[PDB]
Amino acid sequence: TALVCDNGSGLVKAGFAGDDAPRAVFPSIVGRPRHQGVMVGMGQKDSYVGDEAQSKRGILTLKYPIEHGIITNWDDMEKIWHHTFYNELRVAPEEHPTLLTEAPLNPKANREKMTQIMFETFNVPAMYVAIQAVLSLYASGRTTGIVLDSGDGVTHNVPIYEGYALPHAIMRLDLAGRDLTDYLMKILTERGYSFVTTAEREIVRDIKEKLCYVALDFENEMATAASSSSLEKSYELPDGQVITIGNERFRCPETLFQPSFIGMESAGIHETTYNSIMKCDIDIRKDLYANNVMSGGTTMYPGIADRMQKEITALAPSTMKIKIIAPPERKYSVWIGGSILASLSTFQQMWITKQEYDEAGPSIVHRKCF
Amino acid sequence: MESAPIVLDNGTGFVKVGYAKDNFPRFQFPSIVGRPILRAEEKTGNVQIKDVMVGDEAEAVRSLLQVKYPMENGIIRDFEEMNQLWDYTFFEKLKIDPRGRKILLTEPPMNPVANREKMCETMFERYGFGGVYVAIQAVLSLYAQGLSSGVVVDSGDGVTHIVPVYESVVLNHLVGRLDVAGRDATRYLISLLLRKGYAFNRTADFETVREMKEKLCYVSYDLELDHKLSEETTVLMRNYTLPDGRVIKVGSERYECPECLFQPHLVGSEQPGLSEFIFDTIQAADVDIRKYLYRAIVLSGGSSMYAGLPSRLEKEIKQLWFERVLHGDPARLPNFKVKIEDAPRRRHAVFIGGAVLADIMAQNDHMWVSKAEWEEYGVRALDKLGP
Amino acid sequence: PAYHSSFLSLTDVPTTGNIAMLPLKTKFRGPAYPADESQMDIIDECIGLFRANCFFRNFEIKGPADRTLIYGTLFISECLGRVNGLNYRDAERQLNSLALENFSIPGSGFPLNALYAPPLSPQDAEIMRTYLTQFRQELAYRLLSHVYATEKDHPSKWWTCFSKRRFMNKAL
Amino acid sequence: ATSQVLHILPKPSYEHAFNSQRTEFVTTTATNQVELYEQDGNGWKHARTFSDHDKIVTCVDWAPKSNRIVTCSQDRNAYVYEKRPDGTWKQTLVLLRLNRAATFVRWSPNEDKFAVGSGARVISVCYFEQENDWWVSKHLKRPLRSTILSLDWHPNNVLLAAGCADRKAYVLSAYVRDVDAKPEASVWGSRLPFNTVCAEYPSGGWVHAVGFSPSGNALAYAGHDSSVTIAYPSAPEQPPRALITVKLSQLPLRSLLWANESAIVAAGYNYSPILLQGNESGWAHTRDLDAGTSKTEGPVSFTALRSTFRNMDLKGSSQSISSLPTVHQNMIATLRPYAGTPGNITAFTSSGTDGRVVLWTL
Amino acid sequence: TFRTLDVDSITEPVLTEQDIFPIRNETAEQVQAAVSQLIPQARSAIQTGNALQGLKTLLSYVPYGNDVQEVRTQYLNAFVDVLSNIRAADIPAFVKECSTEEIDNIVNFIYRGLANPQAYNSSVLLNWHEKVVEISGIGCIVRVLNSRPDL
Amino acid sequence: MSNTLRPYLNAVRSTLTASLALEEFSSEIVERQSQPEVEVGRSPEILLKPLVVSRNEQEQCLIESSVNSVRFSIRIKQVDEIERILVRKFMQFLMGRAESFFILRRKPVQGYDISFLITNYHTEEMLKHKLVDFIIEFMEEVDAEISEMKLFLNGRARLVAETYLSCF
Ligand SMILES: Nc1ncnc2c1ncn2[C@@H]1O[C@H](COP(=O)(O)OP(=O)(O)OP(=O)(O)O)[C@@H](O)[C@H]1O
Ligand SMILES: Nc1ncnc2c1ncn2[C@@H]1O[C@H](COP(=O)(O)OP(=O)(O)O)[C@@H](O)[C@H]1O
Ligand code: BEF
Ligand SMILES: [Mg+2]
Ligand SMILES: [Mg+2]
DSSP, X not given: OOEEEEEOSSEEEEEETTSXXXXXXXXXXEEEEOSOOOSSSTTOOSOEETHHHHTTGGGEEEEOSEETTEEOOHHHHHHHHHIIIIIIXXXXXXXXXXXEEEOSSOOHHHHHHXXXXXXXXXXXXXXXXXXXXXXXXXXXXXXXXXXXXXXXXXXXEEEEETTEEOGGGOEEESOSHHHHHHHHHHHHHHHTOOOOSTTHHHHXXXXXXXXXXXXXXXXXXXXXXXXXXXXXXXXEOTTSOEEEEXXXXXXXXXXXXXXXXXXXXXXXXXXXHHHHHTTSOTTTHHHHHTXXXXXXXXXXSXXXXXXXHHHHHHHSOTTSOOOEXXXXXXXXXXXXXHHHHTTSTTGGGTSEEHHHHHHXXXXXXXXXXX | OOSSOEEEEEOSSEEEEEETTOSSOSEEEEOOEEEEEEOSSOOOTTSOOOSSEEHHHHHTTGGGEEEEOSEETTEESOHHHHHHHHHHIIIIIIOOOOTTOEEEEEEOTTOOHHHHHHXXXXXXXXXXXXXXXXXXXXXXXXXXXXXXXXXXEEEOSSOEEEEOEETTEEOTTTOEEESOOTTHHHHHHHHHHHHTTOOOOSGGXXXXXXXXXXXXXXXXXXXXXXXXXXXHBSTTOEEEEOTTSOEEEESTHHHHTGGGGTOGGGGTOOSOOHHHHHHHHHTTSOTTTHHHHHTXXXXXXXXXXXXXXXXXXXXXXXXXXXXXXXXXXXXXXXXXXOOEEOOTTGGGHHHHHHHHHHHHTSSOTTTSEEHHHXXXXXXXXXXXXXX | OOOOOGGGGOOSXXXXXXXXXXXXXXXXXXXXXXXXXXXXXXXXXHHHHHHHHTTOXXXXXXXXXXXXXXXXXXXXXXXXXXXXXXOHHHHHHHHHHHHHSOOOOTTOOOTTTTTSOOOSSTTHHHHHHHHHHHHHHHHHHHHHHHHTSSOSSSOOHHHHGGGSOOGGGOOO | OEEEEEEEOSSOEEEEEEOTTSSEEEEEESXXXXXXXXXXXXXXXXXXXXXXXXXXXXXXXXXXXXXXXXEEETTSOEEEEEEOTTSOXXXXXXXXXXXSOEEEEEXXXXXXXXXXXXXXXXXXXXXXXXXXXXXXXXXXXXXXXXXXXXXXXXXXXXXXXXXXXXXXXXXXXXXXXXXXXXXXXXXXXXXXXXXOEEEEEEOSSOEXXXXXXXXXXXXXXXXXXXEEEEEEOOSTTSOOSEXXXXXXXXXXXXXXXXXXXXXXXXXXXXXXXXXXXXXTXXXXXXXXXXXXXXXXXXXXXXXXXXXXXXXXXXXXXXXXXXXXXXXXXXXXXXXXXXXXXXXXXXXXXXXXXXXXXXXXXX | OGGGOOOHHHHSOOOOHHHHSOOOOSOHHHHHHHHXXXXXXXXXXXXXXXXXXXXXXXXXXXXXXXXXXXXXXXXXXXXXXXXXXXXXXXXXXXXXXXXXXXXXXXXXXXXXXXXXXXXXXXXXXXXXXXXXXXXHXXXXXHHHHTSOTTO | OOTTTHHHHHHHHHHHHHHOOOOOOBOSSSTTOBOOHHHHOOSGGGEEEEEEEESSSSSEEXXXXXXXXXXXXXXXXXXXXXXXXXXXXXXXXXXXXXXXXXXXXXXXXXXXXXXXXEEHHHHHHSOHHHHXXXXXXXXXXXXXXXXXXXXXXXXXXXXXXXXXXXXX
16 A cells, blocks of 8 residues: 555645545644643643644634645645644554655745655655646546646646647646635625634635535626525624625636636636647647546536536637536545556556665656656 | 373474373463564554563564574473473463372483483472473374384474384384474575575564465475476465565475475585485394384374375385385385375374373373482482483 | 663562662652662663664563663653754753653553553552653753753754654654 | 355355255365355355365365264365354364375265265275264275266265266265165165275266266266266166267366256356256257356446556556356356255255355256 | 486386277277278269268278377378368358267367378368367367377 | 467467366375376376467467366467577566466477466466467467567667768
């Protein structure tokens, strides 16, 4: 067995290769206390990690060590990996290879320090660093398609044909569920309700995860919510009081299809997918159009597969069929795909091994993992 | 349990224990003692390690133990550890009060006299047995067969030894040790496996290669045939799973390991192996009795159990009378009747024979060395026990 | 061969579970009998041996003085795990808090529960806790005089780097 | 005819026996263990292992009325296992006195003695003595020239058929005095002391299987040349009334069973039971009991995702390796009565080298 | 040294193929006459074009034994010559009408023709092998594996 | 490839599937040992007659069989000395891996290029219809594998010729 540790920017998703689904899913958060620690003894800790922080958050400054899929704070990222292996999986990491992941078009130094900490702190016996939108394509049961992965921090497209990636046609967009959370705070502020702190940012994430949905036709949905009760509904806070919301429920997800709302100049996710298909060689485009693959938690909004199929069918030539593949387990497909990969018998030849790291130094990942 | 004499084959690799008239050992366990150790290995609350752990208690838990052997070559190397086997044997396997009991012990045919003395002293002065007898291990294996002639060869964990017998007379000038047995084949199996890169040099791994040898090894009947299967073919290869869960592939080491009983030079001994040792022993007996020895060679002891050993040994004596008595003339070979006795029970024949002998002499109280006789003559009380 | 305790040669020393309540030089309150102030008690031995004994990976235990030395050798690794980046004035207080916080005794959560005898009675558990808290308070205080030897505001790296090292791959 | 798959064993199952209550069965895995399986509602569960043999177990059998199991192995031992009142099994070593492996064992119909075939050119007929509490072996050895591949007893306790690798099927008297009543004067003979020979019938290939008719008045046996032969004896020293050989178009039979006085099921390397029918005028292959003789989208599971990639990686391509059309996927090693009155088998069972244990109803 | 001196060959005499298969009753000159009368019937059946009646008559007797290679080879020469002179579309009409005894004589000798390609054309024997096994089933090869070694 | 080998490989497939009717068998000459009896040959009554299947004087199979073992040995096409070297070496890689192709010998029988030993244990623990499919799919493809290697040898003979000759 080998660990598969998809340290995403919003959730760590971890477990064992060939296991059905990730067994350690928790916030990619380190919390530190912000108040007068008056009661002596009491089992107090200098910092808290994951669900241990999320449940204590009313006294903590929660901060994610990872932003837009790039590690910003290594002293806390080691704290998350240590929590993953010793507290959440309860293994010794020196006994198991780890398949890690990262998004494409990351800094070189991210990939180096992430191999160095696995070999020099966690003492791991072998490791590998897969591209997240390649893994999501194993989890679809395919060898050609265009994975749209979108998580908490990054959205990216990787077009693949016959198992060859077309790396010139990879699109990264630094917009995903954390920007939709920050935008939901900016529009909730307009109805009556103020959310400000790093802990209140989790309450509005827990709104976004169950009140929001994607409108199939935003400009007509906007007129319908401005003229009826049916689109409005309510959520009950930790403080027992009720929050009622309406056109905020679909204006939030719409930022993915209209990044101009949060001040970005870019294509939306629909036109970013088409700009990746139209960068590919002309003979493969039909087999990409019939195999768009949704992945990552930001693709979980009710109606996003219907909307994505509508917007791509308007951009694509009407002569040919579009399919969006969106399984119900697309919430974890990058982990699911790493759990396939780390169990394929040729894969056991591809690991960076401890001995090979010791001899080659941390630059070995650049001449073995892609 | 029983009121009759207790009997104890304190072998080099296994203790076997029970009473007179037992048809099979009442208990048997590795003759091992262990002390607690920690070793960059798994630990568990499933078991509690006491300061001295022995027999089955150690062998079932040996990942946690510094395993040590009180015996080598059939002699006690460390009496402080043999005391910790004998305490266990009497007080928590048999569950006995030894005060005034009579016990039959065993030892091989050419031991240091200081070993029998300190073994009897311990029986009279730790435990306080009321009577002791010590029998030569291979003459016991002849009572198991219900037999009174024919050369008996015993191969154990520690020593291989031979005792010619004719018409109930024991030929003390012809008894012999080959200092190669089931442990030298095990140290050799570790040394063959080290050529493949598998290392077994922890003290607790020795019982794992004993279990591996005991499971997978066989004696080649025709060396150029097994060297053909070994070098030309995959058919010998076998996968063994260690208690660690590691799997190790073993191949020529299946026949090439127990071959050291037939070729002691593979383990650095200059002595002749079983076939040539039994032949040079029978062929040293007087002209009138040699027929009655070849007509009844008796195998005994656990290291006689290798698959093919009875057939290899019979062939390799027909093959050797042919070289050394017929000078390669085929005309007389069919007249040479050699027979090997290789009964199903033979691993335990020393115990099963001891349990027969301890019935034959249970009531004859002068036949044993009594505690009352030990405490007046000391070591000279053991001169009762034959030449 | 790793380095065993000198005190395994000592006899008729008091015992709890099968820890040895060895003579101790200290100011802390508890049941340990006073040592000679001029002699190496088990804590000067345990601190002297720790930096060598945590590199070995195979350690046979001779008796209750080694079961005591192992608990000390494991608790030094907890202290060096704590101490990184502290001023001595903070380290004293943090490592006394570590020494005094509620811990599992052998026979209760304890890692080496296979090798240490549980307390003989409900009363033996208290004499064990009041010993091990006195032992590990003194062990923390003594260790800090070594790790902050030459400079008082930065733990000497020659002591702090064993914070990743882990006696026989066990920890508390 | 219908097939029901009772259990899938993890290892090859050369032999099995169901107890007389059909509630539990013993079977020989291809190691020194013997498994015991019990009912679990409609399923079967592993109850215990026997493990008293040194080397691979070769055959096993379970006495109907007296409830004792008997076992053979390449270690040259046999054990008889008998139920203690507390619910566990008392092992007992039988001194077979064999120079080479034990291959194949059967309890006699009165269950007072059992016969063991060997590679040693001999058959050890074993019986028990209340005078000694021993099991003691008599060696049939005069005509046997090679390994004994199978045995079957006549429905009277005396006569033993044996199939031997010297391409012949023997009929021997196994009368042992002070166990058997006198044998009745019958088609095979009347002057009938131990090891007297009633036939040395020929075959084209090794005789894998033998069995007497339910009336005892004919013998059937089966060759590695893929033929079944039925021998109809006349009297001692006299040629048979008929020696009908039917040659199959299939791979060899390994096991054989008279369904009634006029029909036989046979099975082996063809992966399927077949039915033969006839009488002393002639015999023919008449049916295959397996419908496999005729050679007869939604969501996708994680284990189908993982296995379609492991198939592309380990094998040529994603596509699954197909089943055989037969119920068994490997040679069917043994074929045994299950239900109906003696001499009208209504159902039988088989166990395979694939580890299937299967119930067949006619 | 002694380890290599075989004794089993001189103290435990093994079985012989004539213990396992019954020895031929007909004498060497009695079969050499019986074959030498049939080969001219087979050679004649080719010369009159009725080659299929050539095979039916040639296959009515078979020579076997370690004493008769100099006429087993002549019988095989005539058999391979007759097989090379039957039209491939007539084969399924011949094979379906052969007894299981005649089929087991055909396929037994095609495996003797396939053993000597430097004297026999394999291409026509492999064609007969496909057709005889497809029509009469796999057991007809198993009866060759099991057959007498001096056939 | 197939269409020229089709008559031959249907004869080999049919012989080899009729030959693979194996069984457990403890040896008659040695006690408590099983041995692959086709490979030892010491007891003759449990050997079956050795059958040759053959397209040509060059291309042949020898099939030897016994109650618990089949040995199968092949000569493949070698029509020039480049195919003699390329075949002789390619088979030494293919037999050098015999511990992982479980049915291979580590040496051929004398006068054969490669040889297989399918023992009883393989027909109990591997799919025996996929064993003959591997033997046959090897005999179809090996002529295409070797002919392709003599193209790559010509391709390098050009690489070194152009690279030497173009720097005058
Ligand atoms: N089937 C077997 N195959 C191989 N070795 C065996 C077998 N059975 C037992 N042995 C070996 O026999 C030895 C134990 O036999 P035994 O009890 O007769 O020795 P012992 O009496 O303790 O030794 P000794 O007589 O020299 O003091 C061990 O080495 C064991 O591995
Ligand atoms: N049901 C949902 N509806 C909308 N957003 C969701 C839903 N489930 C998860 N998310 C969002 O998905 C993000 C986490 O997705 P994930 O794929 O695990 O990201 P990452 O890999 O970067 O950690 C968070 O912003 C979370 O709120
Ligand atoms: F880091 Be997550 F994939 F946005
Ligand atoms: Mg992600
Ligand atoms: Mg002994």
